[PDB]
Amino acid sequence: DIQMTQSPSSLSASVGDRVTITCRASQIISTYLNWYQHKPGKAPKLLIKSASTLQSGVPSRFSGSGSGTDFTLTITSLQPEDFATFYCQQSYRDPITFGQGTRLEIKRTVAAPSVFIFPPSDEQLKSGTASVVCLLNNFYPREAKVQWKVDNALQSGNSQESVTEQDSKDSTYSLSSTLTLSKADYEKHKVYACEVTHQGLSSPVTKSFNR
Amino acid sequence: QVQLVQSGPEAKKPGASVKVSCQASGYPFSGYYMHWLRQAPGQGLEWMGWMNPNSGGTKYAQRFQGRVTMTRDTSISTAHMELRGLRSDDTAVYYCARDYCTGSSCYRTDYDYWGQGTLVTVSSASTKGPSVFPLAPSSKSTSGGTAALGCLVKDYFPEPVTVSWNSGALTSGVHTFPAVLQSSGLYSLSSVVTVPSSSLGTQTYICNVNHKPSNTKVDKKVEP
């Protein structure tokens, strides 16, 4: 019954910057609040217990404050091993409830995507299906828009896209949009093009092939 | 020291039950309460209940009391959880966690150690093995001498599949994408790796795809 709201939903910051995130409780929880760090695919790690006390092994750059309803978590000199989704958790009254999360992103210099396009394999065409694949490689930020056009007729409702997690070395993203057709639909057209609109991209790049 | 190792990922049909386990190592298993939690996709964590491994007594959340059962096996130091009546809402990653304050002098509930997570997928689709297709390199050279090649793992169920390149001897510049659920009900992902275009044809590249629920391992060489 203790709803937990964190602000903001998601933020981006650089290495060495100080950032604060807030955590609001629906009712009074005095100091019965814990802060957790959660990288994707791995276990959550306890960072701050009793809303102000640092957990063993947690570096000194993490700090927490607050009592009652309003709580803050502060990281002072940001490091690349601190970027995760952060949760606050009440422990005053059952049921135990968490915040929705706060994705922490690494700001870096803006990087243009390397655009590659992949025709469907001949092994797939003998199976009667065709998947054309567009690859966007090593870009920042995460927002990029991909549009498929065949013979200058843009497609709609037949393409699915996925984006990787943020890389740990260069803090970049990679995106793969996959247009799926039948074999008769694939061998009916010639031009298969992939248009990319990215923030680090002056004119929209169109990569294409003719098979 | 302390580490909690959970069961592997499972996939159940709607209406059935799942028994997720979690094995404790590095501390006296009795005397620390074992809490079970879950995370719906893109929704944050939900708490489900805690189990006392010394008594077997439990307290489940009121939302889960008809459906969930948390049992112990004290000698192998393993906590179990059995959630019945599985719906499509119950597709989540499930976490076990140790309550430190039931073994120390604090009054909170602090989860200092967590398990690695267990993906439980509830869908009506049956298990189907993946079809692996090459993503052949072509006149694809940005950055100068920089080619891209890949492997498309299409139409499998359930997650996960593990992909590696040249038996794991190629980890640099590889991007394996998260699987996307389709309208058919089947998953598909792609794994790409960027290599210099000078090495095309001199070095042979093989992606190793393994799907443990379907007992499928296929190795296909990607060639220009």
B23: its two tokens: 């094995």
Q: Are residues B90 and B115 in the same domain?
A: yes
CB pair distance less than 8 Å for A43 and B114: yes
Q: Which of A44, A97, A117 sits opposite B114 (nearest CB)?
A: A44
Number of structural domains found in chain B:
2
Domain identity same for B151 and B74: no
Using a CB–CB cutoff of 8 Å, tell me whether B3 touches chain A.
no
Residues B27 and B91 both lie in one domain: yes
Provide, as residue numbers in chain A, all residues whose Cβ is less than 8 Å from the Cβ of B153. Answer: none
Let me know: does A78 contact A13? Beta carbons within 8 Å. Answer: yes
Task: Determine the Cα–Cα distance for residues A108 and A168; give it in Å rounded to an integer.
Answer: 12
CB-based contact B134 A121, cutoff 8 Å: yes
Mutate one of A34, A47, A91, A183 to test the B interface: name it (highest B CB count within 10 A): A91
Q: Does B138 touch chain A (CB under 8 A)?
A: yes
CA distance linking residue B89 with residue B63, whole number of Å: 13
Mark which residues 31-90 of B lie under 8 Å from A by CB: 35, 43-47, 59, 61-62
The answer to whether the A4-106 and A114-209 domains have the same CATH topology is yes
Instruction: Give how far A46 is from chain B: nearest CA, Å.
Output: 5
Q: Which residues lie closer than 8 Å to B215 by C-beta, 6 or more apart?
A: B129
Dihedral, CA of residue A149, residue A154, residue A160 and residue A162, to nearest 10: 60
* A98 chain-B contacts, CB cut-off 8 A: 44-47
DSSP SS3 for B174:
strand
Task: Answer yes or no: do B188 and B110 share one domain.
Answer: no
Question: What CATH architecture is A4-106?
Answer: Sandwich (2.60)
CATH number, residue B160: 2.60.40.10
Picking from B85, B102, B122, the residue at the C-terminal end of a domain is: B122
Question: How far, in Å, CA of A146 to CA of A197, rounded?
Answer: 6
Q: Taking a C-beta distance cutoff of 8 angstroms, is the pair B118, B10 a contact?
A: yes
**Do residues B157 and B175 both lie within one domain?**
yes
Residues 6+ apart with CB under 8 A from A188: none
Question: Which tokens hold the place of B20?
Answer: 């997720």
Q: Are residues B138 and B214 in the same domain?
A: yes
Contact assessment for residue A93 and residue A184, using Cβ atoms and an 8 Å cutoff = no
Torsional class of B117: left (φ above 0), alpha (ψ -120 to 50), beta (otherwise): left
Distance from CA of B54 to the nearest CA of A (A): 21
Please judge whether A50 and B108 are an interchain contact, meaning their C-beta atoms are less than 8 angstroms apart.
Answer: yes
Query: Rounded to whole angstroms, how far apart are CA atoms B39 and A40?
Result: 12
Do B152 and B212 belong to one domain? yes
Name the 3-class secondary structure at B101: helix
Task: Please calculate the CA angle A169-A171-A174 and round it to the nearest 5 degrees.
Answer: 105
Residues B113 and B8 placed together within one structural domain of the fold = yes
Local structure of B209: helix, strand or coil: strand
Q: Is B105 on the interface with A (CB under 8 A)?
A: no
Bridge partners (DSSP) listed for residue A97 = B46
**Structural domain of B157:** 131-222
Interatomic CA distance for residues A48 and A156, integer angstroms: 47
**Is residue B112 less than 8 Å (CB to CB) from chain A?**
yes
B33, B110, B146: best mutation site toward chain A, by most A Cβ within 10 Å? B110
- Both tokens assigned to B105: 């002098």
Half-sphere exposure of B213 (CA within 13 A, CB side): 19
Deposited experimental method: X-ray
Q: Looking at the structure, do residues B118 and B188 belong to the same domain, yes or no?
A: no
Rounded CA separation A196/A207 (Å)? 8
The residue ranges of every structural domain in chain A are: 4-106, 114-209
Closest approach of chain A CAs to the CA of B4, in angstroms? Answer: 10
Place of tokens 């567009």: A134
Residues in chain A: 211
- The total number of residues written for chain B in this structure: 224
Nearest to B45 by CA among A89, A92, A45: A89
Q: Cα separation of B50 and A88, whole Å?
A: 19
Distances (CA, A) of A191 to A150, A206, A209, B139: 5, 11, 6, 16
The residues, ordered by sequence, that sit 6+ positions from A52 with a Cβ below 8 Å of its Cβ are: A31, A64, A65, A66
- B154 touching A (Cβ < 8 Å): yes
Last residue of a domain, which of B104, B122, B140?
B122
Angle at B158 between CA B157 and CA B162, to 5 degrees: 100
Contact between chains at A114 and B95 (C-beta distance less than 8 A): no
Whether A161 and B115 lie within 8 Å, measured CB to CB:
no
SS in 3 state form for chain A? Answer: CCCEEEECCEEEECCCCCEEEEEEECCCCCCCEEEEEECCCCCCEEEEECCCEECCCCCCCEEEEEECCEEEEEECCCCCCCCCEEEEEECCCCCCEECCCCEEEECCCCECCEEEEECCCHHHHCCCEEEEEEEEEEEECCCEEEEEEECCEECCCCEEEEECCCCCCCCCEEEEEEEEEEHHHHCCCCCEEEEEEECCCCCCEEEEECC
- CB–CB contact A114 B143 (8 Å): yes
Cα B166 from Cα B208, distance rounded (Å): 7
3-state secondary structure of B27: coil
- Specify the CATH architecture of the domain A114-209: Sandwich (2.60)
Whether residues A137 and B192 touch (CB distance < 8 A) is answered with: yes
Please tell me the distance from the alpha carbon of residue B89 to that of residue B97, in angstroms, as a whole number.
22
- Is B146 an interface residue toward A (CB < 8 Å)? yes
The type of residue at B179 is: A
The residue from B122, B146, B179 where one domain ends is B122
- List residues bridging with B142 in a β-sheet: B146
